[PDB]
Every structure is written in C-alpha cells, then in structure tokens.
Amino acid sequence: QERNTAWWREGTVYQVYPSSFKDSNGDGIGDIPGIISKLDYIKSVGTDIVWLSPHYKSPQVDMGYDISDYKAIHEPYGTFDDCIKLIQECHDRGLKIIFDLVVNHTSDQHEWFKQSRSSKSNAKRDWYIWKPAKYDEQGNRIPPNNWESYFGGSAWEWDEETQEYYLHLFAKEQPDINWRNLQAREAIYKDAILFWLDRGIDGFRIDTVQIYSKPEDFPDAPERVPGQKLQNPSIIVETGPQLHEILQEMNRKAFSKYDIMTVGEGSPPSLEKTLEYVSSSRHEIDMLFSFDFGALDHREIAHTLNDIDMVEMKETVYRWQRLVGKTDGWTTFFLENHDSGRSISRFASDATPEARNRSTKFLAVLQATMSGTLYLYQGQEIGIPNLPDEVPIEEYKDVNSINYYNAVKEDTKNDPDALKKAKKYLQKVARDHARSPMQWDASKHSGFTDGEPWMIVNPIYPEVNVAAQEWDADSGLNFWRHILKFRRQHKDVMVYGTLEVLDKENTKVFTFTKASESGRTFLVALNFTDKAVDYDVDQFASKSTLLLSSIGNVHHKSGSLQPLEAVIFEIH
Ligand SMILES: OC[C@H]1O[C@H](O)[C@H](O)[C@@H](O)[C@@H]1O
Ligand SMILES: [Ca+2]
C-alpha cells in the first residue's frame, strides 16, 4: 500500500459545526445550503480540508453525536441530495471533506437499539452491552460497578421491561455498542463507513477512538476523584483488549481501499502506545487529537479550573510534536473545536478590541509553527472570544452544561456559592462558547440568520465579524491568511520540522526550534504574559534574522518581547 499522504500531512483543516455555521432559510438553525454558500469563504481562509461535524439523522440530545440512522441526514440541515451536493461543491473548489464517524454508541432511537432493548431473546440483544443488576448489603438494586457517565450520573441505565442495565459512557440516550459482537461490527462497517466512503468523502474524524473495546469483567474504575462514589472509567476503557483488532479491521476492510485521511479523537499518554495507533507500520489510523494541551487550564472529571503551568505546557507541546521527524507516525495541533472554550479567552487576553486582535495573531503563530496537520475551528480566524459573564446559564443549551449545573444544584441543594463557582467554570471551558453562531457581519444576529437563532449569538459580534475583517490589512483574518501562506512556503520546517525546546525553565517565554533535515532551522519565541519581558535571541542562536512578529516587525524591540508577542527567526 503506497499512498498519497502529503495532502493530509500539509493540509489545513477547517471544522464546520452545521447548526451554527450559516442558516439559509431563517428558521434559526444552520444548514447544508448555508455551508455551500460559504465554501468560497472557507477556501479563502487557506483551507484545504473541511471537517463537517455530525449531520446525520439524530434526536439532537448530544447535537448529532447520538445518531438514529447513519444513512440519512438531519432534516433541518437539508435533504440527502443536499449532502451529495455539498461533497461536490467542496470538490469543485479544490476542498476535500471529512465526515464525523461516531461508532462507540448510537441513539436510543436507532432501530438497532429499539430491537436490542425489545427483549433478551431479540437477535440483536448482544449488539449493545446488557448486564444484570447487583444488590447492596441492605437489599437495594445497584449498577454492576462505579462507572460514571461523562455527562454525569451512573453509566448504566435500568431497562424495567427486560430487568437489565445497558452501558452508556455518554448520555442515557447514547447506548454503547458491544464491539465483541461480530454481527454488529459488520452493520457499522456497512452503514457508517463504506456507505459514505462509496459516496466520495475524503475521510473521517473518528470519535472516542480509544474506548470501543471494554474489558470483559467491567471492573470498578480507580478513585480519580477522592471520596466520590462514581468514577469516570476513561483510564480503564481506553485501548481495550480488542481496540487495535478493530482499527486493523477498519483499515483492511474500508480505510485502505480509498484515498482518505483518518484523524482519531483521544490519544494514549505514552509514545509507544500512541505509535500503536498512528505509525505507518501499523496500518490503523493516520493521526490523533490529544486532550493534553486542552487540559492545562481545567480538570474535566473534577470540574475544576486551574492556572496554566508554563513548564507543563512546554512538555505537553514537546510530548506529541516529537512524533514528526523521529518516527514514521504523525500528529495534529489545534486550540479550538466544538468541545472547547474559545482560544483567546483561555490562552491570551480578550479584554479589549486591541487585545482580541493581538491575541488572535499571537495564537496564530503558536499553531502555524507546530508540525503535524493543522486544525482550525469556525470563528477562530476572526478571534471569537467566550460568551461574557452577563450571559446567564439558561443560554448554555449544551447537555454537558445543563447536566453539570443540574448535578451541582441537586448534590449541593441549591448552595448559591457552589452555583456561582459552577457558572464561573462553565464561563471559562464550556462547549457552548464554540456553538454560538458564526459572526459574518454587523447585521441582526451577525448575519447568521434572518430568524431567531437556536442559541445566543456572542454579543461582541458588532466588533468581531468576517465582513469587518475582510478589507482590514491588520485584522486577525488577514493575519491568518498570511501565516498559512508562510506555513506552506516553509513547510520543510513548519509542517515536517522536528521540534526541540530551549530555555526550559523560563516561566514567561516559550522558545523552541523547528529544524528540517534539508538543513534549515527556525526559532520561535512566545511571550504568554501581558507585561514586556527581557528576551535575548543571541543567547539561544549564534546568528538570527527576524522573519515575522505578531505585533508587527517594525514594533519588535531587540532585547525584549512585548505583551503577547510571538516572533519567528531564521537561525544557524
Ligand atoms: O459522542 C459523545 C461525545 O464524543 C465525541 O467525541 C464528541 O466530540 C463530543 O462532542 C460528544 O459529546
Ligand atoms: Ca435552516
């Protein structure tokens, strides 16, 4: 198997969130014709590959990640031929398109589940994970173990009609597929994978790629949150006994028969296990998204915020950037997606118009200099920040936000201080900041819809919008376009370059080198603080020439880095 890999290795991915990108018929929901009408705009950002988030038939409990039919399209997004049209419209403009592959679980409204839960004698019973109840010391009915769902509460839902519990790592409406059942494997391969590979898509975003295979004895998860009864089982379900078997099967049967790229969500903590997923040798998948970088400012399982430790951040960047050049694997880099808070709000300053612009360019240098495939999320190019403090919790429509807040309200019996702390946490890292409609212009709802949007449009939209940034040479959008042109022109060091960290102990400035095997080497310095810091490039590079600064080359002062200034130098 000799393949065309350069297109995914060097390509820039733009992630589209169907519900929030563009509404073409004023019902307040985004749709496929809206996407088709904005494809020229996507191309103009610098995009090679479009990553469409789940658009298939779904009750929208988890906004597309609970699928009720792999072969049909969610009616508000448009018709089945609208989906085929989008694939062609992308292709017409030189854009590839990848779909979201959600196969750890299905909707509870999927016909496969309606059959599974119907009776214990049903032919498709074993297609999902059913377990009998356990009884505690005092005779009460309890689940098979302490596993917690990622959205709160136990991971086992009680089906009274069949007196048995079904496994659900996500919502009660997302029952987990039993991957031990070969008949269910074939059903997924045919409907969720080969059906769309046969319609000409260029690849998939594989969800929760580590958790398909559960250990046969479903043992209690470890005490990750001291003294709490239920425990998230991510650490014991990740890379299960059949996981690599499954990925190997998906490659030989589907991925290897088409010219595509596969990107998996979730990576192991070690290099040798990570290479078991992405090494060319292995013929499984091409690259992985790691949660490490996104986890520097919060701990999801404990719903706690924390200050970013500069040295841990550097070690996290190096942990995965080390795959490029020293191995036959690959890696990715991203600061945003549908499951995260806005990047300028979490990693830079969003306080003022000037700060939003300076921060957008700052993070742009951080991402542009990282090796591996680069991923942008709709909005990131124009510096959309997080929803401000004045937006109340009722507007946070995401199920993860509602379940957490409700669990605080229940477990603390409306402790008002606990609710304020729960809201503060949600204001920094909720998934809702990434789902507020795309900001196109300064008209009603930032020109996203003529109707009433399905979720609140960020109220900074009059300042922050595409049309405002299009003809402004100094906008974050035109900075993003230039930095991607720079990235392609210097791909030997930016895309394929080996990364090495210098001045490790420095807590204010991150300094690293990107070296090609051709010879060429760049040095990147980022001042993550908001005060001027003394910085001397000559202590880390014999000879150097400034190529670009995020604050403007003429504003760069030798012997210092300005607040949130990132610089690229050619050295050696
Ligand atoms: O499908 C359940 C969850 O897993 C997926 O990986 C998605 O990225 C996330 O948005 C979703 O809530
Ligand atoms: Ca619509």
Coordinates of C-alpha atoms and ligand atoms in Angstrom, one line a residue:
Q1 CA 0.0 0.0 0.0
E2 CA 1.8 3.2 -1.3
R3 CA -0.4 6.2 -0.7
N4 CA -0.8 10.0 -1.4
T5 CA -0.2 11.3 2.2
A6 CA 1.2 14.9 1.5
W7 CA -2.3 16.3 1.0
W8 CA -3.4 15.4 4.6
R9 CA 0.1 16.0 6.2
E10 CA 0.4 19.5 4.8
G11 CA -3.3 20.4 4.6
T12 CA -5.1 23.0 6.8
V13 CA -8.4 21.5 8.2
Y14 CA -11.4 23.9 8.8
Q15 CA -14.0 22.4 11.1
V16 CA -17.7 23.4 10.4
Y17 CA -20.4 23.0 13.0
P18 CA -23.6 22.5 10.9
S19 CA -26.1 24.0 13.4
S20 CA -24.0 27.2 13.9
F21 CA -22.2 28.0 10.6
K22 CA -24.9 29.5 8.3
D23 CA -28.8 29.5 8.2
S24 CA -30.1 29.9 4.6
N25 CA -33.9 30.0 5.4
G26 CA -34.5 32.0 8.7
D27 CA -35.5 29.1 10.9
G28 CA -32.5 29.9 13.3
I29 CA -30.7 26.6 12.5
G30 CA -27.6 26.3 10.3
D31 CA -27.9 24.2 7.2
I32 CA -26.0 22.5 4.3
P33 CA -27.1 25.1 1.7
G34 CA -25.7 27.8 4.1
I35 CA -22.4 25.8 4.2
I36 CA -22.4 25.5 0.3
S37 CA -22.9 29.4 0.1
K38 CA -19.9 30.0 2.4
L39 CA -17.5 27.5 0.8
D40 CA -15.7 30.3 -1.1
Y41 CA -15.2 32.0 2.2
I42 CA -13.7 28.8 3.7
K43 CA -11.4 28.4 0.7
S44 CA -10.2 32.0 1.1
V45 CA -9.1 31.4 4.7
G46 CA -6.4 29.0 3.4
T47 CA -8.4 25.8 3.9
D48 CA -7.5 22.5 2.1
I49 CA -9.9 20.1 4.0
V50 CA -13.4 20.7 5.5
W51 CA -14.3 18.7 8.7
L52 CA -18.1 18.6 8.8
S53 CA -19.5 17.8 12.4
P54 CA -22.3 15.1 12.7
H55 CA -25.1 16.0 10.2
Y56 CA -26.9 12.6 10.1
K57 CA -30.5 11.8 11.4
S58 CA -30.4 12.3 15.2
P59 CA -32.7 13.4 18.0
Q60 CA -30.0 16.1 18.9
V61 CA -29.7 15.1 22.6
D62 CA -25.9 15.5 22.1
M63 CA -26.3 17.6 18.9
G64 CA -25.5 15.0 16.2
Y65 CA -23.3 12.6 18.3
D66 CA -26.4 10.5 19.1
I67 CA -27.2 9.0 15.6
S68 CA -30.6 7.4 14.8
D69 CA -29.6 6.4 11.2
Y70 CA -26.1 6.6 9.6
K71 CA -27.6 6.6 6.0
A72 CA -29.9 9.6 6.5
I73 CA -29.4 13.4 7.0
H74 CA -30.9 15.5 9.8
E75 CA -33.9 17.2 8.2
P76 CA -33.2 20.8 9.3
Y77 CA -29.6 20.6 7.8
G78 CA -31.3 19.6 4.5
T79 CA -32.1 16.6 2.2
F80 CA -29.9 13.6 1.4
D81 CA -29.1 15.1 -2.1
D82 CA -28.1 18.4 -0.3
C83 CA -25.3 16.3 1.4
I84 CA -24.2 14.9 -2.0
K85 CA -24.3 18.4 -3.4
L86 CA -22.0 19.7 -0.6
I87 CA -19.5 16.9 -1.3
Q88 CA -19.5 18.0 -5.0
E89 CA -19.4 21.8 -4.2
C90 CA -16.3 21.2 -2.0
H91 CA -14.6 19.2 -4.7
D92 CA -15.5 21.9 -7.3
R93 CA -13.5 24.5 -5.3
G94 CA -10.5 22.2 -4.5
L95 CA -11.7 21.4 -1.0
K96 CA -11.6 17.9 0.5
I97 CA -14.3 17.0 3.1
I98 CA -14.2 14.5 6.0
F99 CA -17.3 13.4 7.9
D100 CA -17.6 12.5 11.7
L101 CA -17.5 8.7 12.4
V102 CA -19.5 8.2 15.7
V103 CA -19.4 4.3 16.3
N104 CA -18.8 3.8 20.1
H105 CA -22.5 4.4 20.6
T106 CA -25.8 5.1 18.7
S107 CA -29.0 7.0 19.6
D108 CA -31.6 5.1 21.7
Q109 CA -34.0 5.9 18.7
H110 CA -31.6 3.9 16.3
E111 CA -33.7 0.9 15.0
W112 CA -30.8 -1.4 16.1
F113 CA -31.4 -0.3 19.8
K114 CA -35.2 -0.5 19.6
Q115 CA -34.7 -4.1 18.6
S116 CA -31.9 -4.8 21.3
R117 CA -34.0 -3.5 24.2
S118 CA -37.3 -5.1 23.0
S119 CA -36.4 -8.5 24.6
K120 CA -33.5 -10.6 25.8
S121 CA -34.3 -13.2 23.0
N122 CA -34.0 -10.5 20.2
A123 CA -31.4 -11.4 17.5
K124 CA -29.7 -8.0 18.2
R125 CA -29.7 -8.2 22.0
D126 CA -25.9 -8.7 22.3
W127 CA -25.4 -5.7 19.8
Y128 CA -25.3 -3.5 22.9
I129 CA -23.8 -4.1 26.4
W130 CA -26.5 -5.6 28.8
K131 CA -25.6 -6.6 32.4
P132 CA -27.7 -7.9 35.3
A133 CA -28.2 -5.9 38.5
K134 CA -26.3 -6.2 41.7
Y135 CA -27.7 -5.9 45.3
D136 CA -26.1 -4.0 48.2
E137 CA -25.8 -5.1 51.9
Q138 CA -29.4 -3.7 52.6
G139 CA -31.1 -5.4 49.5
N140 CA -31.3 -2.3 47.2
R141 CA -30.7 -2.6 43.4
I142 CA -27.3 -1.1 42.3
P143 CA -25.4 -0.9 39.0
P144 CA -22.7 -3.5 38.0
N145 CA -19.8 -1.1 39.0
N146 CA -19.0 2.5 40.0
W147 CA -18.6 3.8 36.3
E148 CA -19.8 7.5 35.9
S149 CA -21.1 8.8 32.5
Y150 CA -19.0 11.7 31.0
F151 CA -22.3 13.7 31.3
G152 CA -22.9 12.8 34.9
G153 CA -24.6 10.1 37.0
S154 CA -24.1 6.3 36.5
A155 CA -23.1 4.8 33.1
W156 CA -25.8 2.1 33.5
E157 CA -29.5 2.9 32.7
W158 CA -32.1 0.4 34.1
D159 CA -34.5 -1.1 31.5
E160 CA -37.5 -2.1 33.6
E161 CA -39.2 -4.1 30.7
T162 CA -36.1 -6.5 30.5
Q163 CA -34.9 -6.2 34.1
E164 CA -31.3 -5.5 33.0
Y165 CA -28.8 -2.5 32.8
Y166 CA -27.4 -1.1 29.4
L167 CA -23.9 0.7 29.2
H168 CA -23.9 4.4 28.3
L169 CA -20.5 6.2 28.7
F170 CA -22.2 9.4 27.4
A171 CA -26.0 10.4 27.7
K172 CA -28.7 7.8 28.8
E173 CA -29.8 8.3 25.1
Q174 CA -26.4 7.1 23.7
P175 CA -26.3 3.4 24.4
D176 CA -22.7 1.9 23.9
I177 CA -22.3 -0.7 21.0
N178 CA -20.9 -4.1 22.2
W179 CA -17.8 -4.4 19.9
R180 CA -17.4 -8.1 20.9
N181 CA -20.4 -8.9 18.6
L182 CA -19.1 -9.5 15.0
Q183 CA -22.6 -9.0 13.5
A184 CA -22.8 -5.5 15.0
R185 CA -19.3 -4.8 13.7
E186 CA -20.4 -5.6 10.1
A187 CA -23.5 -3.5 10.5
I188 CA -21.4 -0.4 11.4
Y189 CA -18.8 -1.1 8.7
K190 CA -21.5 -1.2 6.1
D191 CA -23.8 1.7 7.2
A192 CA -21.4 4.2 8.9
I193 CA -18.2 3.7 7.0
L194 CA -18.5 2.1 3.5
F195 CA -21.8 3.8 2.8
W196 CA -20.1 7.2 3.0
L197 CA -16.7 6.1 1.5
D198 CA -18.8 5.0 -1.5
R199 CA -20.3 8.5 -1.8
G200 CA -16.8 10.1 -2.4
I201 CA -15.9 11.7 1.0
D202 CA -12.2 12.1 1.7
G203 CA -12.0 10.6 5.2
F204 CA -13.4 10.6 8.8
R205 CA -13.0 12.3 12.2
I206 CA -13.2 9.0 14.4
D207 CA -14.8 9.9 17.8
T208 CA -13.5 8.4 21.1
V209 CA -11.2 6.2 19.1
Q210 CA -9.6 4.7 22.2
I211 CA -12.8 3.4 24.1
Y212 CA -14.5 0.9 21.6
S213 CA -13.4 -2.3 23.4
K214 CA -14.4 -2.6 27.1
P215 CA -12.6 -5.1 29.4
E216 CA -14.8 -8.3 29.7
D217 CA -15.1 -8.1 33.6
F218 CA -16.2 -4.4 33.7
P219 CA -14.2 -3.8 37.0
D220 CA -14.6 -0.6 39.2
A221 CA -12.7 2.4 37.9
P222 CA -9.9 3.8 40.2
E223 CA -10.5 6.6 42.7
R224 CA -9.5 9.6 40.4
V225 CA -11.8 12.0 42.4
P226 CA -11.1 11.1 46.1
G227 CA -14.2 10.1 48.2
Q228 CA -16.9 10.3 45.3
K229 CA -18.9 7.1 44.8
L230 CA -19.0 7.0 41.0
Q231 CA -15.7 7.3 39.0
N232 CA -15.1 8.1 35.2
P233 CA -13.8 4.9 33.6
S234 CA -11.7 6.6 30.7
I235 CA -8.4 5.2 32.2
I236 CA -9.6 1.6 32.1
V237 CA -11.7 1.5 28.8
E238 CA -9.0 3.4 26.8
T239 CA -7.1 0.9 24.5
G240 CA -9.2 -2.2 25.4
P241 CA -8.3 -5.8 24.5
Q242 CA -9.9 -5.6 21.1
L243 CA -9.2 -1.9 20.3
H244 CA -6.3 -2.4 17.9
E245 CA -8.0 -5.6 16.4
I246 CA -11.0 -3.3 15.5
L247 CA -8.8 -0.4 14.0
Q248 CA -6.9 -3.1 12.0
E249 CA -10.2 -4.5 10.7
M250 CA -11.5 -1.0 9.8
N251 CA -8.2 -0.4 7.8
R252 CA -8.2 -3.7 5.8
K253 CA -12.0 -3.5 5.1
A254 CA -12.5 0.2 4.5
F255 CA -9.8 3.0 5.0
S256 CA -7.1 1.2 2.9
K257 CA -9.5 0.8 -0.1
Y258 CA -10.0 4.6 -0.7
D259 CA -7.6 7.7 -0.9
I260 CA -8.6 9.2 2.5
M261 CA -7.2 10.6 5.8
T262 CA -8.3 9.3 9.3
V263 CA -7.9 11.5 12.4
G264 CA -8.8 9.9 15.8
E265 CA -10.2 11.8 19.0
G266 CA -8.1 10.9 22.1
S267 CA -4.5 9.7 22.4
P268 CA -2.7 7.5 25.0
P269 CA -0.3 9.1 27.4
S270 CA 2.9 7.3 26.2
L271 CA 4.8 7.5 22.8
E272 CA 5.0 3.7 22.1
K273 CA 1.2 3.3 22.7
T274 CA 0.5 6.4 20.6
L275 CA 2.6 4.9 17.7
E276 CA 0.4 1.7 18.0
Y277 CA -2.3 4.0 16.6
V278 CA -0.5 6.3 14.1
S279 CA 2.7 4.5 12.9
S280 CA 2.6 3.8 9.1
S281 CA 3.9 0.4 10.0
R282 CA 0.7 -0.4 11.8
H283 CA -2.0 0.4 9.1
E284 CA -4.6 1.6 11.5
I285 CA -5.2 5.4 11.5
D286 CA -3.1 8.4 10.4
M287 CA -3.0 10.9 13.3
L288 CA -4.6 11.6 16.7
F289 CA -6.0 14.6 18.6
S290 CA -4.6 14.6 22.2
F291 CA -6.6 16.2 25.1
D292 CA -3.3 17.1 26.9
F293 CA -3.0 20.7 25.6
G294 CA -6.7 21.5 26.2
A295 CA -6.4 20.0 29.8
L296 CA -3.8 22.6 31.0
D297 CA -6.3 25.1 32.4
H298 CA -9.0 22.7 33.8
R299 CA -9.6 19.0 35.0
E300 CA -12.9 17.8 33.3
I301 CA -13.5 14.8 35.7
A302 CA -13.4 17.1 38.8
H303 CA -15.0 20.2 37.0
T304 CA -12.2 22.4 38.4
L305 CA -10.3 25.4 36.9
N306 CA -6.5 25.9 37.4
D307 CA -3.7 28.3 36.3
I308 CA -1.7 27.0 33.3
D309 CA 1.9 25.9 34.4
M310 CA 4.2 27.2 31.7
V311 CA 6.7 24.3 32.1
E312 CA 3.9 21.6 31.9
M313 CA 2.6 23.4 28.7
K314 CA 6.1 23.2 27.1
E315 CA 6.4 19.5 28.0
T316 CA 2.9 18.9 26.5
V317 CA 3.8 20.6 23.2
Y318 CA 7.0 18.5 23.0
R319 CA 5.3 15.2 24.0
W320 CA 3.4 14.9 20.7
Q321 CA 5.4 17.3 18.4
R322 CA 8.3 14.7 18.9
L323 CA 6.4 12.2 16.6
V324 CA 7.2 14.3 13.4
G325 CA 10.8 13.5 12.1
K326 CA 11.9 11.0 14.8
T327 CA 9.2 8.3 13.9
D328 CA 7.0 7.1 11.0
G329 CA 3.9 8.4 12.8
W330 CA 2.2 11.8 12.6
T331 CA 0.4 14.2 14.9
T332 CA -2.0 17.1 14.9
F333 CA -2.3 20.5 16.5
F334 CA -5.4 22.6 17.4
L335 CA -6.5 25.2 20.0
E336 CA -10.3 25.0 19.2
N337 CA -13.1 22.6 18.3
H338 CA -16.9 22.1 19.1
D339 CA -16.0 20.7 22.6
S340 CA -13.9 23.6 23.9
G341 CA -13.9 27.3 25.0
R342 CA -12.5 30.0 22.6
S343 CA -8.6 30.1 22.5
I344 CA -8.1 33.9 23.0
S345 CA -10.3 33.7 26.2
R346 CA -8.3 30.7 27.7
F347 CA -4.7 31.3 26.4
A348 CA -4.3 35.0 25.8
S349 CA -6.3 38.3 26.6
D350 CA -9.8 39.1 25.3
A351 CA -10.4 42.2 27.4
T352 CA -10.3 44.9 24.7
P353 CA -10.6 45.2 20.8
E354 CA -6.8 45.7 20.6
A355 CA -6.2 42.7 22.9
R356 CA -8.5 40.5 20.8
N357 CA -6.6 41.3 17.6
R358 CA -3.1 41.0 19.3
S359 CA -4.2 37.6 20.8
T360 CA -5.6 36.2 17.6
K361 CA -2.3 36.8 15.9
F362 CA -0.3 35.5 18.9
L363 CA -2.1 32.1 18.9
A364 CA -1.9 32.1 15.1
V365 CA 1.9 32.0 15.3
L366 CA 1.7 29.2 18.0
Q367 CA -0.4 26.9 15.8
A368 CA 1.2 27.9 12.4
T369 CA 4.7 26.8 13.7
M370 CA 3.5 23.4 15.0
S371 CA 4.4 20.3 12.9
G372 CA 1.7 17.8 12.0
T373 CA -1.7 18.5 10.4
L374 CA -3.1 22.0 11.5
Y375 CA -6.8 22.3 12.5
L376 CA -8.9 25.5 12.7
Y377 CA -12.5 25.8 14.0
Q378 CA -15.1 28.1 12.5
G379 CA -14.7 31.5 14.2
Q380 CA -11.0 31.1 15.3
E381 CA -9.8 33.0 12.3
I382 CA -11.7 36.2 13.3
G383 CA -11.0 35.9 17.1
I384 CA -14.5 35.0 18.5
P385 CA -14.0 35.1 22.3
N386 CA -16.0 33.2 25.0
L387 CA -19.6 34.4 25.9
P388 CA -19.2 37.2 28.5
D389 CA -20.1 37.0 32.3
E390 CA -23.5 38.8 31.6
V391 CA -24.8 35.8 29.5
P392 CA -26.9 33.7 32.0
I393 CA -26.7 29.8 32.4
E394 CA -30.1 29.3 30.6
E395 CA -28.4 30.3 27.3
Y396 CA -25.9 27.4 27.8
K397 CA -28.1 24.9 25.8
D398 CA -25.4 22.2 25.7
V399 CA -26.4 18.9 27.6
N400 CA -23.0 18.8 29.3
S401 CA -23.5 22.3 30.7
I402 CA -27.1 21.5 31.8
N403 CA -26.3 18.1 33.3
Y404 CA -23.2 19.5 35.3
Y405 CA -25.1 22.6 36.6
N406 CA -28.1 20.5 37.5
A407 CA -25.9 18.0 39.3
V408 CA -24.4 20.9 41.4
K409 CA -27.9 22.2 42.1
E410 CA -29.0 18.6 43.2
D411 CA -25.8 17.5 45.1
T412 CA -25.5 20.8 47.0
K413 CA -29.3 21.5 47.4
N414 CA -29.0 24.9 45.6
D415 CA -25.8 26.0 47.5
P416 CA -25.7 29.5 45.9
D417 CA -21.9 29.8 46.3
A418 CA -21.5 26.4 44.6
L419 CA -23.7 27.6 41.7
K420 CA -21.6 30.7 41.2
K421 CA -18.4 28.6 41.1
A422 CA -20.1 26.1 38.7
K423 CA -21.1 29.0 36.4
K424 CA -17.5 30.5 36.6
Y425 CA -16.2 27.1 35.5
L426 CA -18.7 27.0 32.6
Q427 CA -17.8 30.6 31.6
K428 CA -14.1 29.5 31.0
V429 CA -14.4 26.0 29.5
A430 CA -18.0 25.0 28.5
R431 CA -18.6 23.6 25.0
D432 CA -21.2 26.4 24.4
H433 CA -18.6 29.1 23.7
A434 CA -17.8 27.1 20.5
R435 CA -21.5 26.7 19.5
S436 CA -22.6 30.4 19.5
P437 CA -23.4 31.2 15.8
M438 CA -20.6 32.2 13.3
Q439 CA -20.2 36.1 13.2
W440 CA -20.5 37.1 9.4
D441 CA -21.3 40.9 9.5
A442 CA -22.8 43.5 11.9
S443 CA -26.5 42.9 10.9
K444 CA -29.2 41.2 13.1
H445 CA -27.5 38.1 14.8
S446 CA -24.2 38.9 12.9
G447 CA -25.9 38.0 9.6
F448 CA -26.1 34.2 10.6
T449 CA -29.9 34.1 10.3
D450 CA -32.9 36.3 9.4
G451 CA -35.0 34.4 12.1
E452 CA -34.3 33.8 15.8
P453 CA -31.1 31.8 16.3
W454 CA -31.2 28.3 18.0
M455 CA -28.6 29.6 20.6
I456 CA -27.5 33.1 21.5
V457 CA -25.0 35.0 19.2
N458 CA -22.0 36.3 21.1
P459 CA -22.8 40.0 21.8
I460 CA -19.3 41.2 20.8
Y461 CA -20.4 40.4 17.1
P462 CA -20.7 44.2 16.1
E463 CA -16.8 44.5 16.6
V464 CA -15.8 40.8 15.8
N465 CA -17.2 39.7 12.3
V466 CA -15.9 38.4 8.9
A467 CA -17.0 41.5 6.9
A468 CA -15.3 43.9 9.3
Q469 CA -12.0 42.0 9.0
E470 CA -12.1 41.3 5.2
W471 CA -10.6 44.5 3.9
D472 CA -8.6 45.4 7.1
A473 CA -4.9 44.5 6.4
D474 CA -4.4 44.4 10.2
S475 CA -7.3 42.0 11.1
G476 CA -6.7 38.6 12.6
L477 CA -8.3 37.0 9.5
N478 CA -5.7 38.6 7.1
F479 CA -3.0 37.6 9.6
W480 CA -4.3 34.0 9.5
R481 CA -4.3 34.0 5.7
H482 CA -0.7 35.3 5.6
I483 CA 0.6 32.9 8.3
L484 CA -0.9 29.9 6.3
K485 CA 0.8 31.2 3.1
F486 CA 4.1 31.4 5.2
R487 CA 3.5 27.9 6.6
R488 CA 3.1 26.3 3.1
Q489 CA 6.1 28.3 1.7
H490 CA 8.3 27.0 4.6
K491 CA 6.6 23.6 5.1
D492 CA 10.0 21.8 5.4
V493 CA 10.3 23.3 8.9
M494 CA 6.7 24.3 9.8
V495 CA 4.8 21.1 8.8
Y496 CA 7.6 18.5 8.7
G497 CA 10.2 20.1 11.1
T498 CA 11.5 18.4 14.3
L499 CA 10.7 20.5 17.4
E500 CA 13.2 21.0 20.3
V501 CA 12.6 23.1 23.4
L502 CA 15.2 25.7 24.6
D503 CA 15.4 27.7 27.9
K504 CA 13.1 25.1 29.5
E505 CA 12.9 26.7 33.0
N506 CA 11.7 30.1 31.6
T507 CA 8.2 30.7 33.0
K508 CA 7.2 33.8 30.9
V509 CA 8.6 32.9 27.4
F510 CA 8.3 29.6 25.4
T511 CA 11.3 29.2 23.0
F512 CA 11.6 26.2 20.5
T513 CA 13.4 25.4 17.3
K514 CA 11.8 23.8 14.1
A515 CA 14.6 22.0 12.1
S516 CA 14.2 20.5 8.6
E517 CA 16.5 17.6 7.6
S518 CA 17.4 19.6 4.5
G519 CA 19.3 21.8 7.0
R520 CA 17.2 25.0 7.5
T521 CA 16.2 25.8 11.2
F522 CA 13.7 28.4 12.6
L523 CA 13.5 29.7 16.2
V524 CA 10.1 30.7 17.7
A525 CA 9.7 32.7 21.0
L526 CA 6.3 33.4 22.5
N527 CA 5.7 35.8 25.5
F528 CA 2.5 34.4 27.1
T529 CA 2.4 37.1 29.9
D530 CA 0.8 40.6 29.4
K531 CA 3.9 42.6 30.6
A532 CA 7.1 43.3 28.5
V533 CA 9.8 40.6 29.2
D534 CA 13.6 40.9 28.6
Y535 CA 14.4 38.4 25.9
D536 CA 17.8 37.9 24.1
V537 CA 17.7 35.7 20.9
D538 CA 21.5 35.8 20.7
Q539 CA 21.8 33.6 23.8
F540 CA 19.9 30.8 22.0
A541 CA 21.0 31.2 18.3
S542 CA 24.6 32.2 17.1
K543 CA 23.1 34.2 14.1
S544 CA 19.4 35.1 13.5
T545 CA 17.2 37.1 11.1
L546 CA 13.6 38.2 12.2
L547 CA 11.0 36.8 9.7
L548 CA 7.8 38.0 11.5
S549 CA 6.4 39.2 14.8
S550 CA 2.6 39.0 15.7
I551 CA 2.8 42.8 16.8
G552 CA 4.5 43.9 13.5
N553 CA 8.2 43.7 12.6
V554 CA 8.7 47.5 13.0
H555 CA 7.2 47.2 16.6
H556 CA 9.6 44.4 17.6
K557 CA 12.2 45.8 20.0
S558 CA 15.6 44.0 20.1
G559 CA 16.2 42.7 23.6
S560 CA 12.5 42.4 24.7
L561 CA 9.2 40.7 23.8
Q562 CA 6.1 42.9 24.1
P563 CA 2.9 41.6 26.0
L564 CA 1.6 38.6 23.9
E565 CA 4.2 39.0 21.2
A566 CA 5.3 35.8 19.2
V567 CA 8.3 36.0 16.8
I568 CA 9.8 33.6 14.2
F569 CA 13.5 33.9 13.3
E570 CA 15.7 32.0 10.8
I571 CA 18.9 30.8 12.6
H572 CA 22.1 28.7 12.3
Ligands
LIG1 O1 -20.3 11.4 21.2 C1 -20.1 11.8 22.6 C2 -19.1 12.9 22.6 O2 -17.9 12.3 22.0 C3 -17.5 12.9 20.7 O3 -16.1 12.5 20.6 C4 -17.7 14.3 20.5 O4 -16.6 15.1 20.1 C5 -18.3 15.0 21.7 O5 -18.7 16.2 21.2 C6 -19.5 14.2 22.1 O6 -20.2 14.8 23.1
CA2 CA -32.1 26.5 8.4

